[PDB]
Design an enzyme around this catalytic site. Structure first.
Site, short mmCIF file in Angstrom:
data_model
loop_
_atom_site.label_atom_id
_atom_site.label_comp_id
_atom_site.label_asym_id
_atom_site.label_seq_id
_atom_site.Cartn_x
_atom_site.Cartn_y
_atom_site.Cartn_z
N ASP A 69 45.05 35.54 42.54
CA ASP A 69 46.26 36.30 42.96
C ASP A 69 45.88 37.77 43.09
OD1 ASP A 69 48.07 36.05 39.75
OD2 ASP A 69 46.63 37.59 40.37
N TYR B 133 45.11 24.88 46.95
CA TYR B 133 44.64 25.86 45.94
C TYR B 133 44.09 27.17 46.53
CZ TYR B 133 41.53 27.70 42.16
OH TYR B 133 40.83 28.49 41.27
N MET B 134 44.34 28.28 45.83
CA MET B 134 44.00 29.63 46.26
C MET B 134 43.23 30.33 45.15
SD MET B 134 45.33 30.26 49.34
CE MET B 134 45.65 32.00 49.45
N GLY C 43 54.65 29.15 35.29
CA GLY C 43 55.76 29.22 36.23
C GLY C 43 57.01 29.22 35.38
N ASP D 117 61.39 38.58 44.95
CA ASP D 117 60.45 38.69 43.81
C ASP D 117 59.00 39.00 44.19
OD1 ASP D 117 59.76 38.83 41.09
OD2 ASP D 117 59.48 36.61 40.91
N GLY E 228 48.39 29.41 35.46
CA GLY E 228 49.64 30.15 35.59
C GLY E 228 50.70 29.67 34.62
N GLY F 101 57.54 25.45 33.96
CA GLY F 101 56.36 24.80 33.41
C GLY F 101 55.13 25.56 33.83
#
Ligand SMILES: CC(=O)N(c1ccc(-c2cnn(C)c2)cc1)[C@H]1CC[C@H](Nc2ncc3ccccc3n2)CC1
Ligand SMILES: [Mg+2]
Ligand SMILES: [Mg+2]
Lengths: 293, 238
Positions: free
Chosen positions: A88, A84-85, A15, A128, A13, A18
């Site tokens: 998305d 952890y997943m 973010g 969001d 990802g 960072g």
């Protein structure tokens, strides 16, 4: 604790301050995500927005909401540590080769809306929501994520908040037209958009400017006008930002391939007048979600 | 995390392992807290932000010593972070100007060649030391909630609150926020106010026939704890 306590595997990802990283805890073996927060090359210290995100996360203890395990540091940045997943939501849909059954969606939305109702009951607006901020692992379990634009809102009275929030495609019309004294209904509009996009795979309103976004919403949900939304005339850009024609609501004819219980929910979630839009609590009593294990 | 100590373990600080005697430590704590209070007050920051910063300051020095961390720099750092936490942010440049306005050449020496850098650097450590437990509540909010529920002479009740308010400001120079939850400090300053004005506070509660008026606001507070808090605050005026 230190970040050498983890085994870094790769980048999963970007973010806001960072990268996010995938990693293995050396003591327990578990897989985790690490949101980096960069400091060096900052002018006003640890980012105030990160401080804001962290206060909020620390208060959030719900099965369907991201839960921050700890924060750690370099041997100079900090890393927020989460369980952890696997995916998305935007990632599953974009491949294609993934269809969600009526029951996959049922389950998925019950989780999301219970997530959101918990947040709203505790006076937070997410502000969001969108497919890339919903995480989902292979157990079928959902977690609502990225509280980087969230904030406390006041329910005992009304107050003015920042208007440019929620990415264009999941942004409700009250914000397009310039409202500042808005409500948790903004998050429900975005979730309504998810529900539609779950049945089509394409995000349902995809313009690049606000004016064009308003057009796309009007063309489906009806042009906003005082007959369906009396307060609308009191918004700053209601005269400035008009759809071309005065369109009739035609949501149900466009989405009549959807099952009927879902169509009722979708219709209700994408209602133009925020005070007529359903709440997260209300969705959970809809026929589509009422009985889902 | 648990941010509360017995009085026994408070006297066992990093500054004490390192040779600093208790009087000097207690003086460095008061000077620091008052410094935070004075800087924030000059910047127009309001009572919760000031108190948050002072709490960070008191906690920080249960894990580090004054011999290593000069106090006015730490104070400025705690306030800077508090402003961000309480959504009343101030620029680091403005905190330094204000600090400089209140210190003398020697005292400000602590800030060094780059006053701003010394503070930013310290913020990383501060955050680690307070374990990112950023949310903190203070006695003021409970002083107002509890006093609002008394019914009776408004002038007397207002005088009580006003005295009790000042007593909260005073408590902040001390380690009382490391001994007792803010809920309890509130009840105590009300109790102190109560004694000095000679107001029977139970008469303004729903139950005039119960001595322990505070039990409706907090459960389980021994009178000797309140006495103890009272004695510590009074020691400041001796
Ligand atoms: C396509 C896709 O499905 N993904 C992906 C998304 C971007 C990228 C990628 C690679 N480079 N860039 C810029 C993005 C590479 C895979 C997954 C998305 C969920 C991720 N897991 C996760 N879990 C918990 C978390 C908690 C807080 C914050 C983040 C968290 N993330 C795993 C990757
Ligand atoms: Mg995001
Ligand atoms: Mg507060």
């Amino acid at each position: 604790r230190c970040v050498d306590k983890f085994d870094i595997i790769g980048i999963i990802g970007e973010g806001t301050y960072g990268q996010v990283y995938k990693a293995k805890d050396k003591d327990t073996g578990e897989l985790v995500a690490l949101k980096k927060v960069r400091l060096d090359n900052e002018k006003e210290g640890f980012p105030i927005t990160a401080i804001r995100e962290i206060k909020i996360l620390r208060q959030l203890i719900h099965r369907s909401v991201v839960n921050m395990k700890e924060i750690v540091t370099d041997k100079g940045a900090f890393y927020l540590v989460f369980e952890y997943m696997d995916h998305d939501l935007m990632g599953l849909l974009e491949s294609g080769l993934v269809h969600f059954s009526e029951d996959h969606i049922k389950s998925f939305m019950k989780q999301l809306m219970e997530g959101l109702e918990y947040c709203h009951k505790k006076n937070f607006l997410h502000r969001d929501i969108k497919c890339s901020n919903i995480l989902l692992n292979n157990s079928g379990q959902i977690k609502l994520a990225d509280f980087g634009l969230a904030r406390l809102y006041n329910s005992e009275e009304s107050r003015p908040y920042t208007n440019k929030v929620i990415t264009l495609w999941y942004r409700p019309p009250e914000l397009l037209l310039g409202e500042e004294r808005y409500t948790p209904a903004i998050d429900v509009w975005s979730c309504g958009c998810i529900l539609g996009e779950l049945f089509t795979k394409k995000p349902i309103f995809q313009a690049n400017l606000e004016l064009a976004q308003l057009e796309l919403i009007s063309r489906l949900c009806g042009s906003p006008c005082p007959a369906v939304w009396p307060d609308v005339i009191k918004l700053p850009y209601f005269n400035t930002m008009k759809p071309k024609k005065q369109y009739r609501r035609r949501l149900r004819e466009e989405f009549s391939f959807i099952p009927s219980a879902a169509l009722d929910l979708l219709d209700h979630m994408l209602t133009l007048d925020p005070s007529k839009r359903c709440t997260a609590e209300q969705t959970l009593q809809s026929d589509f979600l009422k009985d889902v294990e | 995390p648990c941010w509360y100590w017995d009085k026994k373990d408070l006297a066992h600080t990093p500054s004490q392992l390192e040779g600093l005697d208790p009087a000097t430590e207690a003086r460095y704590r008061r000077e620091g807290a008052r410094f935070i209070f004075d800087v924030g007050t000059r910047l127009g920051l309001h009572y919760d932000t000031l108190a948050t910063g002072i709490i960070y300051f008191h906690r920080f020095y249960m894990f580090h010593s004054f011999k290593q961390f000069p106090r006015y720099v730490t104070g400025a750092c705690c306030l800077f972070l508090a402003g961000k936490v309480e959504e009343t942010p101030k620029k680091c440049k403005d905190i330094i100007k204000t600090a400089r306005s209140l210190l003398n050449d020697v005292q400000f020496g602590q800030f060094g060649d780059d006053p701003k850098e010394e503070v930013m650097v310290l913020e990383r450590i501060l955050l680690q030391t307070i374990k990112f437990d950023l949310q903190v509540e203070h006695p003021y909010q409970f002083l107002l909630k509890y006093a609002k529920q008394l019914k009776g002479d408004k002038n007397k009740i207002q005088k009580l609150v006003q005295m009790a308010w000042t007593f909260v400001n005073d408590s902040l120079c001390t380690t009382l926020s490391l001994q007792w939850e803010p809920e309890i400090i509130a009840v105590a300053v009300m109790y102190l106010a109560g004694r000095l004005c000679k107001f029977e506070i139970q008469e303004w509660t729903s139950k005039p026939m119960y001595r322990r008026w505070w039990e409706q606001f907090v459960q389980d507070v021994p009178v000797d704890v309140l006495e103890d808090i009272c004695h510590q605050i009074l020691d400041l005026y001796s």
